């Protein structure tokens, strides 16, 4: 009356997965491949602290806005952090030429050095160096940019200035200057004493002649006139020449920059933190190496591909609910006592149900599913892509093209990831069912006609099979001629 | 008394492709590709489109005299134009950021055309009576409706210092022009100042135009030119026009209540009131299916475009390999058994019968329905802004966009076909699984009370009446009852 | 006596990767990744490419004196440029929209260089003898062959009004230059006009250039500049040049007819006369394979570049020398002698040789796997690819966007393909594990209880079965009552 049954394992469950054919399927074990949390703090990126700007923008920090003195000491950074609505920067009204391009240049810079390209006293001995305005007020007092100097006429004369600088820093030198546009002709005749002024910025690769434009303009920050801002990158071994007779905001401090590639500027009000993380988002930082995430499309660093999914769970064990042939077939029950493995046997000579587990098939299935999951996670490589671009009001076609690229990538990744989850969950369930079916077939082949097939995955022995005989059956060392006669 | 296990067959001629086999006839199939369009420029979303007819966008905004039928159009869901519009820019000139302006105007829910500068009061000394034969309407020479040609009066052109403030709480499109004469004689006769200038300045825009006088080839029977410029005055902003000549003044500006993400279609199809969720130059597409092959550029709720001609998914069995069930021991499809997918044949007192086991059939239907519905539903449509326009100097852009779309088209066309093939095979491998298991179940119940014929049929040793057959079908076959 | 079922095995060391297992040795496999280039710049679409040699594109079109070997060109499919553009813009200056001109000159079906304004006849009131050491040739000062330097004559620089009509009925590329002297004295000595202007006007182009005198750093031992501008006169359009000085006039224009959009390849590899459909900077590749890892930048109908180093798909069984419970089940190892097919039987009793090969199952499996591989290869159809893009210093953002377009695509194709070749491989192996197993069952039901099931994939006939009845068994016919008792 001895019986040996073959079955699988079930536990407390409470974890669900989705397959191609069925939804809300409950499984013994599963793995999450979707990151859905962030620390809420702007950690360091690969050991390089971000350049926080606070109440200032990139234009103000580079130009030297008076109210931006809390961040003068900056040497190395990987990305630039901005508040959602910077309040300081371009205190004097004007237009920043190629501003977004300069921001992209400055997002990735090493060994940032601020150096006086033209000394305040030596460079301009014949000009009124001092120049201030109420728009760029500092501590309740009128002031001007720290890195620029408002040259004005001295002794009723503006001598023709011709100042040349050679790049001796063996790097690329960002040089910034400005051109002043008074709102009234008399203001020009007083500041520069020349109605027809000119500005000429010349390099081996740069050449531009700015001509002052005098007209009545709406008041911005209580100033009708406008200072236009321009910038250039002087290459090593190159010389830049400024030649002017008026309306020139002369450079004072230039910046030596090490070449950087591929970083972006994050705009968020979340706090900065001492932590170091390998992937940054505006709202937080993600430490997990899961293939996909559902936090924010704009990511900096080697980040998981963004998806529009809320659940991506992959099956790693048998279905916890008690197709192929074995599970939901001639064996529609789950041995909750199978705490040693996935596939096992049963004893009735002296033991009960759910006592031993066949570690061979269990180990084979474990290795197969582990390789499947590891391949799915690992096949994605590092990106280090600063997804997210900035375009002005005259570049809306650029904005829409970038939006289309990001949206297409998002849609492809979401669709493919969800499909793979469904198909591989179904295939994993089928794989477990095939493994247990093969185990039952092996037991049947070993027993031959010395046992009766009950129908519920059990065999009733035609002889007395003591515990050691059961060990022989499970070990594969069953001796049919021993009990044949 | 014999019980035979079999599957379903019918007269279906539907054909699918699998990974291992091609041109496979199946009992049932589902289409995932939409290839039919109504051929009508139907309504999109909830608003009707705007058709420019013979006119272009430039002629519409600037006020070409032949586009007088387009003045009353206040709101639109999307813009459609004839393939090669002729009206627009009647006076030769250069429209600065014209493609950019088209992109801005496409995503506009509604607009109000208002007289930014009244024709009489704004310019008292300046003569406002200026027309040309290049812009001719009803024989008489004419000029733009929303622009005005300023010329000197009594041999004098006083300096103009006009300004306007945005009180509409919406962005205001302002259009103006700068006239470049062919010869200095026209410059000194129409403006009386040989060296003129124009300055348009706001809180975010500032540009100075100096007239350029040179001999130019005749376009629309005209040597002189008029360069057109535009700006989008933000709410709470003021625009200033200051000039001593060669200024084409704005006469009508447009308060734009802007939308988001709309485009312009170059189509010649007639319009219809379909309220369709999708739109293409040729016609409209049903968004129910996940893939379409009608037109690459699409606007609205349009499915993903693919470069494939057939994407058919199996939702049934093979009409008339793995698990060895279909084309194995069972090699015939039961055309009579139309009740379900799998079943048995009656015998004994029952002369015949083609019963269909509803358990496995309903389970398979649920599974395959979930598969197909997952394939269709997992696809999201969102909104399509496919297509861009680039000028002659943005060729590098035109290729890059061409790289994008084609690239995506190379992915979706490939994967989908794989998805159609890879799953179809499995679908078939699903069906032959179920019946096989079903057979095994019967083979388990009868034990030695029946002999295995070999063709999916069991010959009962004992007499199996209708009640006994129903006992076998339900799985409650009483082995002790019929042991003898 | 006995009949055994088994699968084919050989000594092939070709290994593959599957979802569940890695380093799986298979009897046969197919490579789907191309990693070989001949190192030769084969011509594409049957048209020989244009190799500029040591000349930049600007030097070639402007007519650089050293770039005289590139004058006699008629047609090309793509442009090849050496990594060292030594020759080009010999006189310092700025080339307006140079990247766009390179983009629009990468593919020209018919290229003709015609003297739009003859040197001897167009300018009788001006001196045309303008040369400089910046563009010197054969040891003496020279100038661009396709441009002309106009200066004053008899101490006078009269007004210039020249017009050309597009009678070529093609796209007339016209190049001109504006000279910016370093000193006012040079301007007054060469052009005799301190305030000059150059107006270039057509039906769709109109630009006024004002000379900009300023002290400039010496680049080519020259403190002046010559800014270069160009336009494409449309058919039926007339171009007009009007200038009182500082004009570098056109001498030879080009009647272009643009073709299928292509790019520019930077390569120093030898230009061989092989013919190919795909081109890479390093060489040319297979293109019949759907995937490649030679170079991300490609020209022509090229396979989708992937970041994979091994993309191999199984076409046979697992090579086990001497799921579904087969291959790893009842037959632990496959026969190393059966070479006529993938599945077969073992002769015994009358003929103990053991030769057999079930042709029907083997051929069906071959057809299925061949259809799988052919579908995977063929379903990827790619048209002409021109992924190469060029952007200036002020278009870095654009460049990054292009990179984001490229790398992202590389992230997709790499992830899917490998994953795909991981999945189907396993399936293919499982497919084999189906067939053989089914074959075993087909024998079992055919032999019923006339044979003892040994369990190693064999049936030991209780009766005496000669070669004829064993062949009938392999034919699927076996009279069970005939051999019930023997
Ligand atoms: C740096 O950022 C701060 C914060 O935005 C700036 O303070 C702001 O300064 C403006 C004047 O420049 C203030 O506007 C004032 O509003 C009152 C309202 O009654 C009006 O009467 C005044 O005539 C003036 O328009 C604004 O209120 C003030 N905001 C705050 C929060 O302090 C500061 O000016 C910036 N500094 C630089 C150098 O950019
Ligand atoms: C994938 O599996 C193959 C074998 O199927 C590996 O090839 C074999 O790798 C061994 C590694 O030491 C090489 O050394 C040989 O080892 C054997 C013992 O296995 C030893 O008897 C020999 O004297 C020799 O030292 C061996 O040459 C090589 N080839 C063969 C035909 O055995 C391969 O390394 C595996 N790859 C991975 C990534 O695991
Ligand atoms: C076309 O390209 C050739 C080859 O590059 C140019 O020849 C010039 O060759 C010399 C060596 O013979 C290169 O070295 C330079 O020599 C000068 C003295 O001639 C010396 O002062 C420099 O310091 C340097 O060592 C020289 O770079 C090279 N010139 C250029 C522009 O690359 C030839 O001049 C080129 N012709 C034109 C019209 O661009
Ligand atoms: C506007 O386009 C039309 C053709 O689309 C041009 O042709 C005129 O068409 C109208 C009817 O729409 C006729 O009444 C005129 O006689 C046609 N004139 C010519 C010269 O063909 C028309 O010229 C265009 N008008 C403008 C101002 O561009
Ligand atoms: C080139 O690509 C083909 C794509 O099918 C690879 O396949 C070969 O195709 C040729 C031509 O049909 C056959 O003669 C070979 O027998 C095929 N070989 C295999 C392994 O399929 C081919 O291998 C590729 N060439 C390489 C990688 O050098
Ligand atoms: C499952 O529930 C039982 C309830 O008795 C509890 O003892 C056991 O610890 C639970 N196991 C898990 C893994 O939650
Ligand atoms: C689906 O699964 C979730 C698991 O969180 C469970 O809360 C919910 O009740 C289930 N619903 C159905 C209909 O099975
Ligand atoms: C300074 O520049 C003005 C404007 O071009 C010019 O008139 C004047 O002669 C110049 N003076 C010197 C000393 O260079
Ligand atoms: C399949 O083959 C039959 C037989 O020639 C043919 O009539 C039918 O059109 C084919 N269908 C397809 C889709 O190729
Ligand atoms: C367009 O032009 C054609 C040709 O002159 C004319 O017949 C037709 O009526 C015009 N349609 C509109 C809408 O202007
Ligand atoms: C108009 O502006 C010009 C600018 O050149 C100036 O010369 C002229 O005096 C102005 N008109 C009057 C009436 O002042
Ligand atoms: C002409 O009237 C306009 C309208 O304000 C004004 O700008 C201009 O000064 C007037 N001309 C005069 C007063 O000479
Ligand atoms: C391996 O098999 C191939 C194909 O049959 C054969 O050409 C080769 O000689 C074999 N090598 C060895 C060492 O048996
Ligand atoms: C290009 O210049 C290099 C300089 O070393 C020279 O070796 C090579 O022969 C030159 N090639 C041509 C085609 O002029
Ligand atoms: C040359 O052009 C200038 C500027 O356009 C003009 O002032 C002068 O009269 C012209 N001279 C001749 C001879 O055409």
From TrEMBL, chain A:
Its main location: host cell. GO terms for cellular component: host cell plasma membrane; viral envelope. InterPro entries: Capsid_hemagglutn, Hemagglutn_HA1_a/b_dom_sf, Hemagglutn_influenz_A, Hemagglutn_influenz_A/B. Signal peptide: none annotated. It is found in: Host apical cell membrane. Glycans are attached at residues 12, 24, 55, 126, 160. This is Hemagglutinin. The lineage of its organism: Viruses, Riboviria, Orthornavirae, Negarnaviricota, Polyploviricotina.
